[PDB]
Amino acid sequence: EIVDTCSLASPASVCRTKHLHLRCSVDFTRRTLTGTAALTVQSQEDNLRSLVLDTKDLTIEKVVINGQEVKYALGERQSYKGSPMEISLPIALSKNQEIVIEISFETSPKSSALQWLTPEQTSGKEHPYLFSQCQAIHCRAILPCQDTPSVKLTYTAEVSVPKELVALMSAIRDGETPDPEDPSRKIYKFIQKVPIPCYLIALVVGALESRQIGPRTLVWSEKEQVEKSAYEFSETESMLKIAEDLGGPYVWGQYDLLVLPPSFPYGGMANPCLTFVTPTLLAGDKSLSNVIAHEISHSWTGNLVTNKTWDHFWLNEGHTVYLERHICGRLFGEKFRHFNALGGWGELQNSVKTFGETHPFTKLVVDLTDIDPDVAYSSVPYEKGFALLFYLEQLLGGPEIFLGFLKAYVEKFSYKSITTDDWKDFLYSYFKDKVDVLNQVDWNAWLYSPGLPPIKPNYDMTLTNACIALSQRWITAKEDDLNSFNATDLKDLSSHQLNEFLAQTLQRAPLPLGHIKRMQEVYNFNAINNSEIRFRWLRLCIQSKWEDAIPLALKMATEQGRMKFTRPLFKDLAAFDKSHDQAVRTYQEHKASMHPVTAMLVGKDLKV
Amino acid sequence: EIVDTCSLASPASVCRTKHLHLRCSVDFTRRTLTGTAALTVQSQEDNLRSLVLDTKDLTIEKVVINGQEVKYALGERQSYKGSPMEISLPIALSKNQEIVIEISFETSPKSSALQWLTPEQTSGKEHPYLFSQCQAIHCRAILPCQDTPSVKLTYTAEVSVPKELVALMSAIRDGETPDPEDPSRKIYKFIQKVPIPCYLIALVVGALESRQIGPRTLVWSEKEQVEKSAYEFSETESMLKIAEDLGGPYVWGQYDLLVLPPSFPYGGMANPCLTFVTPTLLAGDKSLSNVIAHEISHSWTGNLVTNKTWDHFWLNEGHTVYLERHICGRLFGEKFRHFNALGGWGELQNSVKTFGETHPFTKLVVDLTDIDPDVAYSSVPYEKGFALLFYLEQLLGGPEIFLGFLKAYVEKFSYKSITTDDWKDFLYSYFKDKVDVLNQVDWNAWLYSPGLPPIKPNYDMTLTNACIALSQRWITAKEDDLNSFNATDLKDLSSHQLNEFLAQTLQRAPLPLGHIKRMQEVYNFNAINNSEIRFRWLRLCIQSKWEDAIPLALKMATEQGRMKFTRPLFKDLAAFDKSHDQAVRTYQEHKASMHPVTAMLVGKDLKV
Amino acid sequence: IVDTCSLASPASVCRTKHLHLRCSVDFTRRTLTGTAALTVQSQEDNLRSLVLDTKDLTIEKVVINGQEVKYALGERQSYKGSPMEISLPIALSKNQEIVIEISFETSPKSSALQWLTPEQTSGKEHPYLFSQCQAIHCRAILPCQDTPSVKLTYTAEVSVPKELVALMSAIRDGETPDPEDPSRKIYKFIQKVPIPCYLIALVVGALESRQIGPRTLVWSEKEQVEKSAYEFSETESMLKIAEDLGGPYVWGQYDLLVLPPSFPYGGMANPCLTFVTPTLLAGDKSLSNVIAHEISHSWTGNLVTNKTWDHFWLNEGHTVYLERHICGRLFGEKFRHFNALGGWGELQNSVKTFGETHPFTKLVVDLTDIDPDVAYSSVPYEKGFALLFYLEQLLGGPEIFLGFLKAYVEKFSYKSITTDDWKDFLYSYFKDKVDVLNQVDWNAWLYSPGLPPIKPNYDMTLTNACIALSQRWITAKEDDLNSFNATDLKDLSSHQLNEFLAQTLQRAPLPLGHIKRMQEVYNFNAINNSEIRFRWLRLCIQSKWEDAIPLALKMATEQGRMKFTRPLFKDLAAFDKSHDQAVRTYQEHKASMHPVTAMLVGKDLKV
């Protein structure tokens, strides 16, 4: 009934991959991954004679079944979807019959899933570095697979690397041995016994060291960042404990963190057993830990209960933002949960404004037919999804009651892949005594209409009031008022409130260039290295036509690669007449060394 | 007085679109139409402060009036009717005041008006293909409009396409030029000076070539079908001359023919200046040219005199079938007109039997409140409408007298949209001297009752007798009579009589399996490629439980897409237990690549 | 005699004896859906088909003896609707009966119904529905012989959202949860007295009740229920008087329902459940003559019924006659004459408006090709009353003539009759006074347009002070305006204030300075008595006082009684200063107005 319009492989209704055994070697002299993917596949129908896998820029050497090579054909490339690989089975399979297909392959150096870093691009300057990023549909650029989240497989893996480096994966570490075929190399083994969608497969190889920060958590990075990260993320275990109370047991064994080089495109990636995080989280005061609570929460919403197709991405992210903000509310107070919730509604405003209130990507449930998931990615599924759940919480009796539903929903669909209708049907089942309340929800509008939601939740304003007051003072200030502003204006404002003040002001950009110059004089925002504050501050300066900020904005856009920051900065710099040429030139000069997905999207943003 | 319950736009009594200037670009990479629709709108009332247009899956970037963006709101989607779009006018308009509203829009890849074909889906295999089909209410899935046949507008268009392709529209071709903004593209221009309902807007883009077959007729298709099409439709100009004698002057300038890919859902579509036709008319002997005569006749009944709402659809089709059969009668004789007339009564019997004799869709005048016109569509308005006109012909003095009425009717309502009451009132006015005769008509049953009409016209039987004789012989035959059947049974039967023989036999299906095998043995109907004969033959085989015909019926049902054939073949295959599962699997495997309307209806027929 | 307002088979062909209505009220789609089971009796041999009235109904199927039958919906005949011809399975002989079960659904545009959103009600939480079938709108609810010549009993089962209450023109016969939908409730009703179908009535809404007499509950939304119980406290005393005058009350219950402000009439005497406008809520019981009028229909109209609408005056003339006797008993014969004379004034106004040769000023009208809603006026009420009042005084006074009235009701109870029936019985009851009767100009009274040929005699006691004050204002000049004072009113009842304004309105326009002075000394703006405020605002508008424009527009739209709304809209359209805003206001409100009021105001405003 449900079709994954982003995958070219045979659907789960035809056959299902139950297990992957990956045996590969990481070759830094050629920037390629070579090896074998052994897929244990189960037919779901009688007379299954062939099957199709996803691939993208993969070189296929051979396909072996039962010791014999078999016929296969790579179809024509379908742009961002890659090339379908049809495999002719030696004998037709019947329903429930299993077979192991071993595919020998190597990746392209331009694999959209991988970034290869030269030693000069690392912190240590002596060794190279490799990291993967498979979500949404880049796993097919590492290895042939049914690249759809409707299929969940276990996996084991054997990875040969230069013996001076360390390999980690989204799995439990299963030992290391010198490579018997090459004394300069080492083999690291991994095992993942919880079934996962293949977009949760992850690999990192580099000069990595670790620091233990909890009974089940090591923080990993290059030696220059390991201690700073252990401090920054010291709250991890306390958040895991809260998450388990809200979601039920943590089933993944280990919860390690990996702090990647600055070019990592996202704030985090909840790869099971090994969350990847951006080093732009290292604010020095733990103030960006909500990203950690987010990735922790995916250990339930996303990794355990999984969207069946990317049309239903909001199930993954909406519920994860909801759990994230409950974690931070437990740690810092209910008024802080509402502050962050209200801030999230503002980011939704921004996203709808950027797309347009009729744009299809502002629907909660999207149709990705002929759409690249990376192009459609936005805050909408996060924050319109959260807004729906927060609204339902307030409609159905408050946080305690709704968290009861959330825990039961996770238990109901653990280890499965589901759709919006699965979720809604269960909501109605769990709240069968409040069906008349549920039936007052404008379901069509919430789930399927573009634009802002048909109703806005209620938000405590306690921590937001001071932000609104200071922003309005600046917005409505005249020349005769600029002298009244003083560093003391920020006396009782947390970093979170400074960030919100700037977010509110940015929504009403541009300000008079004289206001921005004063703001720097009395507040010295140029000295703040908190990445969220500096991002919004530099966007404010650029959109308000301050030439002094051009080099600072260019520096931040290129010295880190978190798309949340890099794309809007390049976009603002391109729209500023005095920095347009520099923005395009800087992009062209850096795009070879950028992450492949970020490089593509920035290129698209700049129209080059 | 009359309400169009298929449209959400402001009605013609509130405001009227007088002109459309369409400027758009066709993007085969994204499967989108992007551009601007400039609507010249005339208010019909004082103090008009806003108006509503139909849309369906359109992204509305902005709305500009007098060089300034205006406020607009997209309402909730109402399933098959789309989403209404309310525009707040900058200044209230009084009666007769006109404004130009320029709407920037983008279609969805899932536009129900469009089918996008990949190169592999075309005849040439090297280029992609796009064609539209707006009737009844799909124009709103291409551009914002008052999507109601009660409004008639002229239009001009500018269409940008890849330079390797050709664009055509339901309009006079107005030149081509390289696209100034993109050397990879061309711009084709079009002019329609005759006011049309928006359902007659049509666009095709593909690798099209042409042959001239008359002073005002080019036949268009991919190169592989051009010449065969020019032969098949050589009678076009002679049919236009006859039609002009029956209906008055042809006002549209050009009468071009476009032969579409096999997935075109209808036998023809009478888009002004450019009739669309199915390639299943390519029988090799011109025997299916009544479809051409039908589309030609729409140049008067339908395109010039238009039904005001789709409840009065029979005005379009009943009169068009009436003219169609007069054209073919002029070319091939009055006995042949009666032959086709009687065959059409047979098709009415089939339609009433399928719906049931009390179904509201067997009424001549229908009520489509909350009904999707694509679901209600049937041959009832065609054949009950024709039957009413044929009955009246015979009642009022015969064909020469009634053709005089028809010509005066066309002249009276030319360029207008009308109801059944307008028609009937003018019938009484034209036949002032026969009011007592008209008052004998059972108008209440003819117009508003379901089932077969209250009275059957008189039909010459000359050409039908041999078909009845042979059908009866096969129906009443026993196993010992089978050897007497012989190929010489067919020696004096035309293709039309073969077709009617199968139709009469199909009305009494199933036949014994042994009878059907014998029929193939002596007549070799498997060898016949005439789409009408093959369709009825395979239905007979499937309904008579002949397993050998399963792959043939599945082949025809999927290798072309004319709904007249595809839907009943899938239905028959679904009802045959031996082919049920394969019918369903085949639909599921192809539905992504099917026409959107055909896919929806076959999915409904199959109950998936 | 033919009913030119009905397309159904007439009573001489077949007669509906009983209706069993089983329906469901859908507020989402604004439809009534269900089955109308008609028990029909043939009046002729070889009856093989029959025709029913319908208007904007969707017919799903027609069932007789458990089998679907053939039927045909015919061409629409504008306000008359569409005829529905049913083919009977076997021919019927004289007196044979069949039950015909018709599955139907109403249109949201049904001219019989107004659907109200929650915002349009007092409570704001629940929707509301009410019907109004008189004269020929029952055919827009269900198929029927929509003619008062046919009288039927009925039973009904109505399913509604369980939070709402349903009432009908019938005895309440219990309630129960809907066995097929737990969110709904089924209300049952039984009407054992045969009625013409224009007396079928339905209301559904958030209704509450207060008992104000042994056989009277007053129903409304909670916001109005106690104020209405006070306003109409005289109901039982009026019922007792009406029973003395007309004979027994045969209907069982006499409940009252106070509708939302859009109800188009002052009242509608639906049996067992009189509907009234909330504009009767004056706060002092002063508009209770409307209750007396609806009570009186329990005899003249509901028990003795006009055979066709050409004879509407039989219903309304006698009902006004009874109305004014009830109020005369309660408040004195001088008050009866006061009300009678005012009614003559309203007849004057109506005949002047129509014109003295207008066919709608005949007592007996010919409604061929005429929409009854368009012909409706005060002529049948007040010309009918004037005829009976004249005859009263001609034949020996009220005591004698009330003797005729009681014998007339008894003679024709449960029947439908014509003017000739009434006149023949008059001549029979007054055998000894035939010479007196033969002095009456019957052709003038019954069949000629314009004002009656003779005016009755009226006591002037309560009217004199009204005329004196009005003339003082009409003939006053500048030097007289300062002599007017609030004390001018100290001895005038509300009824006399209203009559003073009516007298003054007849002579409109008055000078603008006069109207300004009148508000200064009398403060008529503060009076909320709807009759008084209506005439006051008409006076202000016709006298060109721009300050009254917002007040008149407010009254015209915040309530919907056609007696007030239509003349306020017409006056506003006749005032150049208010014309545009009046048309604009109507266009902005018409979608939310009652369908009949919307049609008529639209016609009045030539939109």
Ligand SMILES: CCCCC/C=C\C\C=C/C=C/C=C/[C@@H]1O[C@H]1CCCC(=O)O
């Ligand atoms: C409704 C459209 C569905 C399209 C789904 C398409 C793409 C998803 C691809 C990559 C997602 C990476 C998600 C990472 C953790 O939730 C993200 C928080 C990181 C945001 C940031 O702080 O930069």
Ligand SMILES: CCCCC/C=C\C\C=C/C=C/C=C/[C@@H]1O[C@H]1CCCC(=O)O
């Ligand atoms: C009684 C009203 C029913 C509602 C249907 C309204 C619109 C129907 C929608 C699309 C109609 C396309 C008609 C095309 C040419 O006249 C048709 C002949 C082609 C039929 C065939 O041979 O496949």
Ligand SMILES: CCCCC/C=C\C\C=C/C=C/C=C/[C@@H]1O[C@H]1CCCC(=O)O
């Ligand atoms: C002389 C025949 C003309 C055709 C008129 C026949 C029927 C008109 C249709 C509806 C009549 C409803 C009457 C209701 C109550 O007796 C009326 C008192 C209410 C008037 C008011 O005070 O607003």
Ligand SMILES: [Zn+2]
């Ligand atoms: Zn996430």
Ligand SMILES: [Zn+2]
């Ligand atoms: Zn046609």
Ligand SMILES: [Zn+2]
């Ligand atoms: Zn009355």
